Amino acid sequence: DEINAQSVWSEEISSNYPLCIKNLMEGLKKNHHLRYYGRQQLSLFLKGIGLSADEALKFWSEAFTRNGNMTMEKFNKELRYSFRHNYGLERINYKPWDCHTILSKPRPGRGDYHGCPFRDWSHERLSAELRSMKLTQAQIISVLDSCQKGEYTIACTKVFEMTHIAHPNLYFERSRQLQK
Numbered sequence: 001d002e003i004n005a006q007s008v009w010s011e012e013i014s015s016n017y018p019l020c021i022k023n024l025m026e027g028l029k030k031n032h033h034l035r036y037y038g039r040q041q042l043s044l045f046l047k048g049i050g051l052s053a054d055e056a057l058k059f060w061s062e063a064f065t066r067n068g069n070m071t072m073e074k075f076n077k078e079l080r081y082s083f084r085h086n087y088g089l090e091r092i093n094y095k096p097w098d099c100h101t102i103l104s105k106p107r108p109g110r111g112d113y114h115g116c117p118f119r120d121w122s123h124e125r126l127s128a129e130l131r132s133m134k135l136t137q138a139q140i141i142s143v144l145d146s147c148q149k150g151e152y153t154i155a156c157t158k159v160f161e162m163t164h165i166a167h168p169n170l171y172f173e174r175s176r177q178l179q180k
């Protein structure tokens with residue numbers, strides 16, 4: 001259980017996240033909240049990587065109440081049930097979303113962090129984030145070229161390739177295979 005409420009905010013573990021998951025964790029940390037599609041993408045991913053039901057509630061409760069965003073009553077009242085549901089602590093088997101599933105969901109608008117950055121971000125914002133992951137302009141160009149072509153899974157696999165079938169949990173599994 002190297003995965004838990006605390007370790008998922010570590011750099012070690014979070015360096016294995018593809019960009020969608022990064023984006024959802026970034027949004028979570030800034031706004032101490034996520035909207036419905038984000039809470040599902042993120043929570044099922046974390047389930048997928050072996051985060052326990054207990055640790056998920058720790059994770060989500062801490063995240064949402066952080067820096068006094070909402071009381072723990074509010075969290076308990078408005079959101080605890082939802083997350084419990086996602087692990088079945090109330091009997092559907094909610095599998096982690098795949099790359100095709102994620103893209104199929106309604107495009108994200110303002111306040112939304114779900115979906116796929118390779119499709120959803122501007123070329124400006126992608127550049128920065130790729131620079132921040134120590135890619136060169138040669139590398140960035142090749143990635144944006146895939147984005148232009150609407151080949152987001154390829155764009156993403158490139159970034160996996162230049163920082164080391166189509167599933168964020170597979171992105172994670174493979175990335176943390178290389179760490180250990």
Ligand code: SF4
Pocket residue numbers: 018019020021098099100102115116117118152153156157166167168171
């Ligand atoms: S490809 Fe699948 S995994 Fe890689 S970023 Fe887009 S959505 Fe997230």
